[PDB]
Write a protein that binds this ligand. Structure first.
Ligand SMILES: C=CC1=C(C)[C@@H](Cc2[nH]c(/C=C3N=C(/C=C4\NC(=O)[C@H](C)[C@H]4CC)C(C)=C\3CCC(=O)O)c(CCC(=O)O)c2C)NC1=O
Ligand SMILES: C=CC1=C(C)[C@@H](Cc2[nH]c(/C=C3N=C(/C=C4\NC(=O)[C@H](C)[C@H]4CC)C(C)=C\3CCC(=O)O)c(CCC(=O)O)c2C)NC1=O
Ligand SMILES: C=CC1=C(C)[C@@H](Cc2[nH]c(/C=C3N=C(/C=C4\NC(=O)[C@H](C)[C@H]4CC)C(C)=C\3CCC(=O)O)c(CCC(=O)O)c2C)NC1=O
Ligand SMILES: C=CC1=C(C)[C@@H](Cc2[nH]c(/C=C3N=C(/C=C4\NC(=O)[C@H](C)[C@H]4CC)C(C)=C\3CCC(=O)O)c(CCC(=O)O)c2C)NC1=O
Ligand SMILES: C=CC1=C(C)[C@@H](Cc2[nH]c(/C=C3N=C(/C=C4\NC(=O)[C@H](C)[C@H]4CC)C(C)=C\3CCC(=O)O)c(CCC(=O)O)c2C)NC1=O
Ligand SMILES: C=CC1=C(C)[C@@H](Cc2[nH]c(/C=C3N=C(/C=C4\NC(=O)[C@H](C)[C@H]4CC)C(C)=C\3CCC(=O)O)c(CCC(=O)O)c2C)NC1=O
Ligand SMILES: C=CC1=C(C)[C@@H](Cc2[nH]c(/C=C3N=C(/C=C4\NC(=O)[C@H](C)[C@H]4CC)C(C)=C\3CCC(=O)O)c(CCC(=O)O)c2C)NC1=O
Ligand SMILES: C=CC1=C(C)[C@@H](Cc2[nH]c(/C=C3N=C(/C=C4\NC(=O)[C@H](C)[C@H]4CC)C(C)=C\3CCC(=O)O)c(CCC(=O)O)c2C)NC1=O
Ligand SMILES: C=CC1=C(C)[C@@H](Cc2[nH]c(/C=C3N=C(/C=C4\NC(=O)[C@H](C)[C@H]4CC)C(C)=C\3CCC(=O)O)c(CCC(=O)O)c2C)NC1=O
Ligand SMILES: C=CC1=C(C)[C@@H](Cc2[nH]c(/C=C3N=C(/C=C4\NC(=O)[C@H](C)[C@H]4CC)C(C)=C\3CCC(=O)O)c(CCC(=O)O)c2C)NC1=O
Ligand SMILES: C=CC1=C(C)[C@@H](Cc2[nH]c(/C=C3N=C(/C=C4\NC(=O)[C@H](C)[C@H]4CC)C(C)=C\3CCC(=O)O)c(CCC(=O)O)c2C)NC1=O
Ligand SMILES: C=CC1=C(C)[C@@H](Cc2[nH]c(/C=C3N=C(/C=C4\NC(=O)[C@H](C)[C@H]4CC)C(C)=C\3CCC(=O)O)c(CCC(=O)O)c2C)NC1=O
Ligand SMILES: C=CC1=C(C)[C@@H](Cc2[nH]c(/C=C3N=C(/C=C4\NC(=O)[C@H](C)[C@H]4CC)C(C)=C\3CCC(=O)O)c(CCC(=O)O)c2C)NC1=O
Ligand SMILES: C=CC1=C(C)[C@@H](Cc2[nH]c(/C=C3N=C(/C=C4\NC(=O)[C@H](C)[C@H]4CC)C(C)=C\3CCC(=O)O)c(CCC(=O)O)c2C)NC1=O
Lengths: 164, 177, 55, 248, 164, 164, 177, 177
């Protein structure tokens, strides 16, 4: 995973040196920032079935053409796999707030995604419209705190810029 | 169109043959089991209104996005057209079971059906699912193994009529795929 | 089966889940109430059958 | 026979007030009057001719067939008088092939497409025994014209829902087009000619141009082929409890 | 979509004419009777949950036989589909008060309904008894204006007439 | 006859429909414009002998060659028949303001007139030069009211586009 | 197909006068009660499926031999056609009440209706009754004196418009006699 | 077709939402200045005979090889079929200015128009110039900035109405491009 620990360890392994004073100074940033990004990861892990299903039909409220014949939301299995694939992405954002970097989103959600959503003909602007709906649904004092919403939205538009 | 006796004489017309006693033993058993063919088609047309509405609403059950905004069974306008279409399909496979040859289902109903559906927007994977429910409804009325509605027959096997009508329902899926 | 017409009028009660077209069925098929997608709830996988007995 | 497009998404068919005016003994019809008359004549001119855009010095040769139409109020006799005109054979008979002339008679006078090669070859059996007037009066004096239009309404393209072949709906959609579409655009050259004589069907984009507003005009096309393979034998299996049964 | 605008130019196109001085008077009636049918529509939009909760159990207080085995509302999915089908109908009543004609009712709700409800054994008299309950629930100075009740109770008994 | 009432009762009859709310809204626009298109109609009934006597003697100001032999008005007998065919149009402009539509104009004074004025060698472009003399001589703020001007000028401009 | 504004001009082309100030007061007393006419025609079309079905079934009650074998409203095919016919009569009178002129009823509906009923054997002594039932039921819904369905109106006099739609039912009962 | 009110309904039916309180001030502000839509559609169709004549006559003066033999408005049957062919283009714009939406322009006029104009040899690069001359003339009638025919209007602006109709002429101007 790309993290704060695994970045400064790999940088000091390619150079072949011990953990320096600047490599311990980065893990102190992991301490002072963990309060905000673990509040967002706990708020998400408790209310995830209601956040996923609210965003799963924000895809079909913008793109009603997906129920046409031959499309990706024809039958019951294809919308079960669609609400699954959104719930997969919201699990990986919960994993990124815990680890502290874009590690689990890169290796498990983004790498290889352009070649799968084109081979199977899933419109990648509809794997985005559910992610973009959640980013604007968030009320900054209501669901989480101020800096917990900064961390929650910054991993939410990393995924948007990686699908676009 | 043809039936099961007309299908044999167009095979012999390619050879300019006579339909003799070697070829006639398939047709002498079509009339020998011909009471059971009639006994099986009023097992289907006596239950045909229940068979259509269960197959269409059983397709809505496994796919609830057909009745949401943007589904193609959404309003009353689109749902009555889907109920009309599954009655047309069940009508033409009762003609084909009665004749004993799938000619009339293949040229009148199924020829050109794939191009209507990709111009009107009809989903073909769920349309195959409504036909595949009423295939299983049709083999349960013929062999008298339905959970309600035991009809009064005579004893023996109708197991070659139940798989003849299952191949007529399989041609509908092969023509709109 | 209960007949439900032999009772007094006003005693058979019914109540829908939500009086909304968009919560009973969304634009996709992910409906919690209508159809075969009522098994796709995040809870209701396990149950409480340690209440009774080892029978 | 429900037909979800017909009076929902299209308009209502035009025509005369009633058919009980013929049994009225002091009149011949509810007398429409010359604002209620000529806007019905605008709909016969847009239907028998396509959108031919006939000029003022071409309508003057049709002066006699309207003057009979505003006294004898039969619509079927007006359509019969306009199909034997010079203005119907100089557009649809003169520079066209034989099955192009035949496929426009089904459009202009029946609102449907021909369902068969056997139905199409019998119209060339009537050409040999009386020319083109034997084709036109046999369409007009048919049973199919009587129990859909009669003397009362213009012969319009009717969405029926319960077509006797499914291919009949396809050839109707190729024959009519959009409202900015006439029928001189091919250089002769019948559009339905290959599909009638072979037994195949039409192209999905050519049909969905002519569909109305509000009927998913084009979606449903998978990005693979648009027709069926007649030689393919697929395996379609049903699940029973034990295994999977291929009732083939 | 039969309205005032989509009939005066569907007759101007059937004769090949321009927008006549007849048809510029028919849109002057759209200026006058808008303020009774918009104010009847906006009252229905902020009160919709309340009016379809009361309309739906007017079916089930009247018709207790519907919970019998084989009848229309025999399980909770069918009760939820009953309250959906009266949530749809008064949404179309809200739509007809915006367009100004009876367009959105008879091409989204009424066309097909004789053929759909006969095949699925859904009774017409239970659909009527829900809509006819809220036709005389309307109170003339209390709920909306005087003429706003005329527009709202014109599309209601249009639907009672076309169903019966 | 083309009016604002005959459009909505022939569009209801053609579909077999009762007169619904969109039809009754279009009669409400006929009550609004009736305070202007009837006051211009009654103004033309008493002011005609000073305005049909203004037009034709200024029709011959532009068109001086029509008093020549071989043309139309070569003697005094046909000028007295030239003032009959412009008293026949202002009596038909007066009728369409009363009935609202273009019915008395199009089915009496327009239909057939392309073929009579072709065969009888009468120039249509002096009728256009004489009907439009009653347009620009018409001013609003002394002669009539504001909306009685723009209904009269829109009915003089209908058969200008029909004769041209 | 005329209306009430198109009656005063076809009485004035015969004299070839301008419609001047004297006869324009008769149409200014049309748009005075124009909202009264619009409020009156809305009450018929809101009650129209009940007005027909109470009328035709009361004709069976007042004349019980109509549903005997050989009767005119005997079978289901004939009973649907009489209900179809009374829908068209109540639709065409309501077209005449909105226009204020009987020339929508007398041409499009009453031409040939007398000769068609004697050609089909439809008896006019029952259809003079079943037209006159909904004649008396139409003035209840205009003057708000009906037993059920007190509709909401504005307080004034509507007894001229109730008598004017009585005259359109006199034009029906004269012509089918 | 859809007008400007039925566009808002088919957007909200995709959401399955009631037309609430936020969209209604786009429709109360349609009918607020809704006199001006009637007060400017009358400015086009009063001058619409002269407008199609000055359109195609300026099409000749910038492409003078149209009246050469070989050009598409060479003969007298072809010149009469493009005065009238631009009458239909002017007619369906004036419907869409009355409706507020380009639905009746695109379904009934622009569907398949270029796909027939290459089938008839109509030079589409010079028919764009035929549209855009009368585009410029229509937006100065609405603005009342013409040299002749100063039609007396009421004081204000129709700057948004001049640009809605300029968008309608650019829809036909891009469809055959
Ligand atoms: C751990 C990370 C991880 C993911 C992010 C997903 C990514 C992903 N999603 C899908 C698969 C899919 N994604 C959709 C999605 C949609 N259909 C629509 O109408 C909309 C476009 C959209 C809803 C948002 C559908 C329908 C499939 C199944 C494709 C198919 O049925 O062929 C597949 C193909 C395999 C399958 O069938 O499931 C994969 C790899 N899977 C993963 O393992
Ligand atoms: C874990 C991720 C997570 C989020 C991104 C948010 C997102 C979110 N918001 C709401 C729910 C809501 N959100 C708001 C919005 C606001 N309310 C206010 O007081 C503010 C003015 C405004 C902030 C923009 C409102 C008014 C509702 C209730 C209406 C609704 O159901 O949306 C709901 C439905 C549950 C509920 O609250 O009833 C969810 C999941 N909450 C989460 O748990
Ligand atoms: C989502 C909602 C939902 C439904 C509506 C039903 C739909 C349904 N019905 C049947 C299956 C059937 N349906 C019928 C039909 C009838 N039985 C009778 O006795 C009547 C006469 C007649 C109308 C009711 C028959 C005879 C069978 C198969 C025999 C059986 O059930 O054992 C099947 C099995 C087909 C298969 O195995 O692929 C399904 C899925 N199931 C659902 O999940
Ligand atoms: C003799 C052969 C024969 C047939 C097979 C049918 C085929 C058929 N179906 C439809 C027309 C239609 N068919 C459907 C049907 C369905 N959509 C779904 O989502 C379901 C899967 C499926 C029902 C099982 C719908 C919804 C329409 C209407 C489309 C629309 O309203 O735009 C039409 C268009 C004609 C019309 O309705 O006006 C035709 C020809 N008719 C025939 O004459
Ligand atoms: C005009 C209408 C008409 C019909 C409806 C059928 C009615 C019918 N079916 C059978 C006769 C029969 N029917 C069956 C059928 C069955 N027994 C079973 O246990 C299976 C469930 C079912 C299979 C479908 C069998 C096995 C026979 C006897 C074999 C035979 O004589 O053909 C017979 C002959 C025996 C008798 O005369 O009693 C008749 C008349 N025939 C007709 O002419
Ligand atoms: C092919 C055979 C054939 C004919 C022989 C003529 C004969 C003819 N003329 C008219 C019809 C007519 N003919 C006239 C002509 C005249 N009335 C007069 O007062 C003048 C003396 C005279 C001119 C010389 C008029 C005015 C009408 C129309 C009558 C009307 O308006 O109803 C009609 C009725 C059709 C209609 O309603 O227009 C017919 C058949 N037309 C034909 O199609
Ligand atoms: C946009 C417009 C629009 C509508 C108005 C509705 C109309 C409608 N309702 C239902 C469907 C249904 N409607 C009911 C209704 C009722 N049960 C009762 O006891 C009462 C009679 C009634 C509530 C008043 C039931 C029970 C079903 C399920 C059908 C079934 O049992 O198979 C269906 C069938 C398909 C489905 O399952 O969804 C349709 C088309 N749908 C629409 O899209
Ligand atoms: C119903 C049809 C109808 C018309 C078209 C006008 C036309 C008209 N103008 C004048 C007569 C006149 N009209 C005017 C008015 C004006 N001169 C101008 O240049 C100003 C723009 C305008 C002020 C509003 C003047 C000043 C005269 C007298 C001079 C003259 O003979 O024109 C007269 C003679 C009697 C009269 O004064 O009314 C008539 C009939 N009046 C009508 O009743
Ligand atoms: C044989 C069986 C039989 C019947 C069916 C009725 C038929 C019938 N009903 C009414 C009478 C009526 N019909 C209605 C109309 C209606 N009533 C309502 O409650 C609804 C609002 C509406 C449609 C159902 C009304 C209101 C009256 C009472 C008199 C009136 O006010 O018009 C009359 C009297 C007409 C008259 O004489 O003036 C008759 C003969 N009578 C019978 O003898
Ligand atoms: C424009 C106006 C207009 C009409 C009024 C009807 C007139 C009309 N009615 C019938 C046809 C009929 N009309 C009746 C009607 C009645 N029998 C009775 O006992 C009652 C007195 C009365 C109904 C209240 C019946 C019973 C038939 C059927 C005759 C038959 O079956 O042969 C027919 C022949 C068509 C058919 O048989 O279906 C026609 C044209 N149609 C129209 O277009
Ligand atoms: C588009 C649909 C449409 C309608 C349905 C009517 C609706 C309507 N009716 C009346 C108005 C009225 N309605 C009546 C009628 C009556 N009072 C009585 O005593 C009798 C019981 C009953 C006779 C039938 C009277 C007396 C008035 C007031 C005078 C008038 O303006 O007509 C008014 C004007 C008063 C107001 O604005 O509040 C309106 C808008 N108009 C429309 O534009
Ligand atoms: C080659 C030969 C040739 C012509 C035939 C004319 C044709 C012509 N006229 C105008 C220009 C115009 N055309 C009109 C329209 C009219 N003007 C009136 O006085 C009437 C009321 C109305 C119908 C005739 C107006 C008002 C303008 C001026 C520009 C404007 O105000 O819109 C334009 C400019 C359009 C543009 O810029 O794209 C052209 C090319 N010019 C030429 O070079
Ligand atoms: C609803 C919208 C609608 C339209 C727009 C027209 C479209 C249209 N235009 C023409 C037909 C034509 N269109 C043009 C037009 C032009 N050629 C030029 O040189 C100029 C650039 C341009 C404007 C003068 C010409 C000259 C013809 C005649 C070609 C011919 O006679 O073959 C035809 C062929 C008609 C026929 O003859 O059968 C059609 C369908 N029709 C419609 O229904
Ligand atoms: C039946 C046909 C019919 C019509 C023709 C119009 C006629 C008409 N136009 C306006 C009214 C108006 N018309 C204009 C328009 C303009 N003023 C200018 O200086 C610009 C050049 C031009 C812009 C295009 C303006 C600005 C108003 C007043 C503001 C408004 O209410 O829109 C009014 C309201 C009265 C007034 O405000 O004075 C009326 C009745 N309405 C109709 O019902």
């Amino acid at each position: 995973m790309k993290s704060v620990i695994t970045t400064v360890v790999s940088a000091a392994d390619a150079a072949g040196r011990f953990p320096s004073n600047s490599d311990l100074e980065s893990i102190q940033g992991n301490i002072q920032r963990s309060a905000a990004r673990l509040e967002a990861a706990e708020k998400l892990a408790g209310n995830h079935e209601a956040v996923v299903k609210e965003a799963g039909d924000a895809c079909f409220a913008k793109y009603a053409y997906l129920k046409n014949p031959g499309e990706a939301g024809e039958n019951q299995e294809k919308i079960n796999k669609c609400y699954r694939d959104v719930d997969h992405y919201m699990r990986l954002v919960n994993y990124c707030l815990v680890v502290g970097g874009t590690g689990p989103l890169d290796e498990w959600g983004i790498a290889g995604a352009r070649e799968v959503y084109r081979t199977l003909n899933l419109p990648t602007s509809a794997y985005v419209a559910s992610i973009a709906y959640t980013r604007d649904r968030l009320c900054v004092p209501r669901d989480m705190s101020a800096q917990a919403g900064v961390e929650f939205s910054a991993y939410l538009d990393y995924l948007i810029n990686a699908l676009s | 169109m043809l039936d099961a006796f007309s299908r044999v004489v167009v095979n012999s017309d390619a050879k300019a043959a006579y339909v003799g006693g070697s070829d006639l033993q398939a047709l002498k058993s079509f009339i020998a089991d011909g009471n059971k063919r009639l006994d099986a088609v009023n097992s289907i047309v006596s239950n045909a209104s229940c068979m259509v509405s269960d197959a269409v609403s059983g397709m809505i059950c496994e796919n609830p996005g057909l009745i949401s905004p943007g589904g193609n069974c959404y309003t009353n306008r689109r749902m009555a057209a889907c109920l009309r279409d599954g009655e047309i399909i069940l009508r033409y496979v009762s003609y084909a079971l009665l004749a004993g040859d799938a000619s009339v289902l293949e040229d009148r109903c199924l020829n050109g059906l794939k191009e209507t559906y990709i111009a009107l927007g009809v989903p073909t994977n769920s349309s195959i699912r409504a036909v595949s429910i009423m295939k299983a409804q049709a083999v349960a009325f013929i062999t008298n193994t339905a959970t309600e509605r035991k009809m009064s027959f005579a004893a023996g096997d109708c197991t070659s009529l139940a798989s003849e009508v299952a191949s007529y329902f399989d041609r509908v899926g092969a023509a709109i795929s | 089966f209960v007949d439900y017409q032999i009772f007094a009028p006003g005693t058979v009660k019914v109540s829908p889940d939500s009086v909304n077209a968009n919560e009973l069925n969304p634009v996709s098929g992910m409906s919690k109430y209508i159809g075969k997608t009522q098994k796709l709830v995040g809870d209701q996988g396990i149950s409480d059958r340690s209440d009774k007995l080892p029978m | 026979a429900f037909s979800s497009i017909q009076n929902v998404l299209t308009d209502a068919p035009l025509g005369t007030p009633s058919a009980m005016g013929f049994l009225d003994e002091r009149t011949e019809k509810p007398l429409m009057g010359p604002s209620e008359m000529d806007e019905l004549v605008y709909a016969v001119y847009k239907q028998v001719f396509g959108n031919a855009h006939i000029m003022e010095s071409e309508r003057a040769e049709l002066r006699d067939a309207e003057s009979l139409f505003r006294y004898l109020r039969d619509v079927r006799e007006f359509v019969r008088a306009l199909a034997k005109s010079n203005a119907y054979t100089s557009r649809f008979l003169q520079g066209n092939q034989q099955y192009r002339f035949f496929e426009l008679n089904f459009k202009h006078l029946l609102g449907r497409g021909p369902r068969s090669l056997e139905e199409m070859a019998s119209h060339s059996a009537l050409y040999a025994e009386g020319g083109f007037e034997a084709v036109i009066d046999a369409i007009l004096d048919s049973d199919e014209y009587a129990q859909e239009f009669g003397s009362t309404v213009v012969p319009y393209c009717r969405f029926k829902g319960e077509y006797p072949t499914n291919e009949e709906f396809n050839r109707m959609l190729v024959l009519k087009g959009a409202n900015s579409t006439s029928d001189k655009a091919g250089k002769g050259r019948s559009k339905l000619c290959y599909s009638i004589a072979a037994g195949c069907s039409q192209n999905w984009l050519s049909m969905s141009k002519a569909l109305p507003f509000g009927t998913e005009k084009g979606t449903g096309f998978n990005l693979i082929s648009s027709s069926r393979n007649p030689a393919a034998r697929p395996r379609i299996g049903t699940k029973i409890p034990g295994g999977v049964v291929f009732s083939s």
